[PDB]
Design a protein around this nucleic acid. Structure first.
Lengths: 196, 50, 86, 52, 122
RNA sequence: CGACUCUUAGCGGUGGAUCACUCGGCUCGUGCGUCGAUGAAGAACGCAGCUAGCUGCGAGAAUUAAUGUGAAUUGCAGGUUGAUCAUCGACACUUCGAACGCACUUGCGGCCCCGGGUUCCUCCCGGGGCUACGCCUGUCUGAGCGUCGCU
RNA sequence: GAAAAUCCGGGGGAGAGGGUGUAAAUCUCGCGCCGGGCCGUACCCAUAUCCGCAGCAGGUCUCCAAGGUGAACAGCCUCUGG
RNA sequence: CCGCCGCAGGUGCAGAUCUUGGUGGUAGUAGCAAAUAUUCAAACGAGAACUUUGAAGGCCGAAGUGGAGAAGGGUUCCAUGUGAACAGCAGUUGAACAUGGGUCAGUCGGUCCUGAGAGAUGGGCGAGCGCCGUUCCGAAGGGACGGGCGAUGGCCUCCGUUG
RNA sequence: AAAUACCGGCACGAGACCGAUAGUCAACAAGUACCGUAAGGGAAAGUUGAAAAGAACUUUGAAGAGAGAGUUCAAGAGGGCG
RNA sequence: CGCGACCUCAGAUCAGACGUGGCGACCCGCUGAAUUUAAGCAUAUUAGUCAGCGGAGGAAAAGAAACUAACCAGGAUUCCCUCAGUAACGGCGAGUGAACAGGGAAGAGCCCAGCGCCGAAUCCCCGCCCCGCGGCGGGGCGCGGGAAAUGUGGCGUACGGAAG
């Protein structure tokens, strides 16, 4: 069949494509450290505001205070039944219940590329030290854990929209003041950093 | 020709026993995809090499 | 009479079945395989034919010895030992 | 060989062979026309080998 | 007759060969029964006789080589069949001994200047 | 009225688009990093109860032993003291191939040793083992108006 | 206006044979005994089994060759066979 | 499977005598016209211008449309069944298809020999795979008649196989 | 030695990748069929249904093909069939 | 004339080993183009690149200065960042083009010959016994053999070394 068909050309059946995609594409974009910091300062700032977190989509109508800082007893937890009961009593569970409702099928070719299920981003639990909080919380759908000394911009503001519902711990919440500093006192855990 | 070598006559002997249709119990199998024998080799049409 | 008539006189073969590579490329007058070069100790392969190499390399045949070398490697080429009986 | 058949047919079937004639078939297998010595009925030993 | 390998390895050199020359005769009767046209009950047996020839000839050939590499065990020159087959390059290696030979000058450096377990303070 | 012709729609064909699927690719990453005279890679030809191919295997031939596993295999028959699967260490591995007795015909031997033809008895028959090149260490045998030596 | 395998005759006469016998060594004479493996062997061989993409008016190496007319293996007509 | 907010691109076709596949009009058209020829009954069969048999009429006319082979083909051979496809009409026919069958050697060939030639070794050359060269810059013979010294088989007789 | 290279090999893990004219030439009996003297050139080809439940039976026909009947949620899915 | 030594080149189906071929992404050694660029073209460029040939390995090659330097000096090799599209090369046209220093990954050093000293103190191999290993090694025991004074082994190598 092939004898005298047509091989070389973007238009030719069989053939190659126009400008074949190379692996020396510049995949990675580097950002300035100062700009990276001034994404996290702004992302935590919107987290405190109640309106931005509901505009982000979180059911915080019944949450106590909107910087939801909990005790350091939460980092001692080792089971999900303990993690569930906390999120019931802080009344964050209606956001976990919203994530279950958002557990549906992906639309498109993603489903045959190991991106089968899609669900909603639930509350973000930022902790200081791990004595089991990560073990206790990881199995609940929606919850992403964060270390305070290692805060991510992809996880504090997912999609590029600001005000992900952040649940803090007591020791986590005090360390922020030293990590990013105040306006009369520079960051001590960063070699040279003031708030913008 | 009539005058053959033992290597050529062995070559022709193999290409006869490959030139038979499928058994009709093969298509009743579970993972069956074979309709007919695609490699059937007629002596007018395809000339066997050599 | 260079075409249709000249084709009629074709009744005596140049090549036969080579006995290394099995291909019908063993010339009878030169007595050398145009595919593999049989009288030459070394296998005829050229880097200008990438397609001709992948036809006739280690992926083609059984590897009836070289398949078990891959199986016998991943335990450390052990010899003489049998497992504990019943 | 024709020798190897004669000494096989003599030992397998307790008989003796007058001569052997061998052709190789178009199928590729070898056929042996094993002419028995005339002090044996081939039909009575064809029944012994168990063909009918 | 179900023929296993457990119950053949205790049997004799002269015992196995007669059982083989019984199965060869039984298979000689089945090959005829395929050509004489009939007996599907016999046709399915010819595999059972083919594989039981393979069982007896294994037990024959195993006890051949058990006896041979027992015979050549203490001997310094043994047949190329009985010598350890690994990879060709792995036979061409230095011995377990020859790798572990230090020169007299190198044994002195190990001796007089042995590598010390030490730690430093901040 | 026509037939015919055109346009539109319904249905039916021709055809295989579209969409939805995906035991396949492609790309990046990781650990390893192993062929062969103990016959490799590659090739040839065989091998299944019923089998062409594909795969699997080698005259023990869609496999043997051992091990683990624990009741199948399955298109159709047929026949737990381990069915079958994986594992694979024991054994086996036809012809060509670096390819090796000499040739590439499957054509010719040479030598030693076994068994028939016997009544080691030389032909004959079958079987078995050797019988390639280059080279290292030693060994044996002789070479030379080589350099000497003693008689 | 082929070579070689293979085969034979001769020329020499080194040797060999037995001492009148149951003679010997020896015989290219007549008979007797045994053995001859391996591979190929079907069919077509051309206006349909080959090669020209095909049952293609092409091409493709030979052997046998009746009766009449006639110089004739010319053409024309016939027998066998097709 | 999709809306909105960002993100990313192999992101929009009428064309390139574009590429691949599909289908039209032409068109039931050109065509099925090289080498003289068919005809009658009958048979099988659903079915006959084509098969088979018989009878007739013709052709090839021994440099054949005849009987055998070599190259090449490789089962086309033969029988029986089949009538889908294929055999450019048809088919009860076939080199199609499907089931089985078929090639028997001391004497016929191959094997053996050498021809023109091809081609190792030694040697020479060459970065090198290799190439040249074939009697050439070679210690190129592993054979036989005779004789002691010995081993052996048969009444070791004296001989065979030997050292 | 180590830091170092690795589009071949043996195992793996993954993807803002391609979705059967794409992605490897090859998702299938693919370096297969086929072509060439040879070197080499080199394809096309995925989808019945949940399960074959793959259409018994009766009927016209020489059969291929239908007509009823039946299976299934569905033949408007009838063995190149979403 | 013979006989024994040695040297030198031979023959062996001599005892025992070894090489060949493949794979070829990566690595080493060679050999080595022309498309193309210069809007022509020949030097240049493409390019020591493709093809060709050989040799490997799990990595290879490189590697412990006949070095960098010109400092108040550094200290094998390899790799990364930078130096640097720089010094320099070039129909000084098109184009080509390192190095040191510095910051890191890793980090490791060494052995001979020679010169000399000790009675060759050294080595390979065959026989028997004995442990013993599917990497053929260990201990004996032998007027057993051989290599070797045309030089084996120990000390020792430029950082010095040896002897008293």
């Amino acid at each position: 069949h092939r004898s005298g068909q047509g091989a070389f050309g973007n238009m030719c059946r069989g053939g190659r494509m126009f400008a074949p995609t190379k692996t020396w594409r510049r995949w990675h974009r580097r950002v300035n450290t100062t700009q990276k910091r001034y994404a996290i300062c702004s992302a935590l700032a919107a987290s405190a505001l109640p309106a931005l977190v509901m505009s982000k989509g979180h059911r915080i109508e019944e949450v106590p205070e909107l910087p939801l800082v909990v005790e350091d007893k939460v980092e001692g937890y080792k089971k999900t039944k303990e993690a569930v009961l906390l999120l019931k009593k802080l009344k964050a569970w209606n956001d976990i219940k919203k994530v279950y409702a958002s557990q549906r099928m992906r639309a498109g070719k993603g489903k045959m590329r190991n991106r089968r299920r899609i669900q909603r981003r639930g509350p973000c639990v930022i902790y200081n030290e791990d004595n089991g909080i990560v073990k206790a919380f990881r199995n609940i759908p929606g919850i992403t854990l964060l270390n305070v000394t290692k805060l991510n911009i992809l996880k504090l503001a997912p999609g590029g929209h600001v005000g992900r519902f952040c649940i803090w711990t007591e020791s986590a919440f005090r360390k922020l003041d030293d990590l990013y500093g105040t306006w009369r006192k520079a960051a001590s855990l960063k070699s040279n950093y003031n708030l913008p | 020709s009539s005058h053959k070598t033992f290597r050529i006559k062995r070559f022709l002997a193999k290409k006869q026993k490959q030139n038979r249709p499928i058994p009709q119990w093969i298509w009743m199998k579970t993972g069956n995809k074979i309709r007919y024998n695609s490699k059937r080799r007629h002596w007018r049409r395809t000339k066997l090499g050599l | 009479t260079k075409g249709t008539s000249s084709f009629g006189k074709r009744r005596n073969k140049t090549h036969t079945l080579c006995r290394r590579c099995g291909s019908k490329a063993y010339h009878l007058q030169k007595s050398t395989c145009g595919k593999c070069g049989y009288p030459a100790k070394r296998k005829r392969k050229y880097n200008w034919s990438a397609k001709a190499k992948r036809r006739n390399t280690t992926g083609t045949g059984r590897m009836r010895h070289l398949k078990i070398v891959y199986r016998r490697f991943r335990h450390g080429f052990r010899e003489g030992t049998t497992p504990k009986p019943k | 060989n024709k020798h190897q058949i004669k000494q096989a047919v003599k030992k397998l079937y307790d008989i003796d062979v007058a001569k052997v004639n061998t052709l190789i078939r178009p199928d590729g297998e070898k056929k042996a026309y094993v002419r028995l010595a005339p002090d044996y009925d081939a039909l009575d030993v064809a029944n012994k080998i168990g063909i009918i | 007759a179900k023929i296993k390998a457990r119950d053949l390895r205790g049997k004799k050199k002269e015992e196995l060969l007669k059982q083989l020359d019984d199965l060869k005769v039984e298979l000689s009767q089945l090959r005829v029964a395929k050509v004489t046209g009939g007996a599907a009950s016999k046709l399915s047996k010819i595999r059972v006789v083919r594989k039981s020839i393979a069982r007896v000839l294994t037990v024959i050939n195993q006890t051949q080589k058990e006896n041979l590499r027992k015979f050549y065990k203490g001997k310094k020159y043994k047949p190329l069949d009985l010598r350890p087959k690994k990879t060709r390059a792995m036979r061409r290696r230095l011995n377990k001994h020859e790798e572990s030979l230090k020169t007299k000058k190198q044994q002195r450096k190990e001796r007089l200047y042995p590598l010390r377990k030490y730690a430093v303070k901040a």
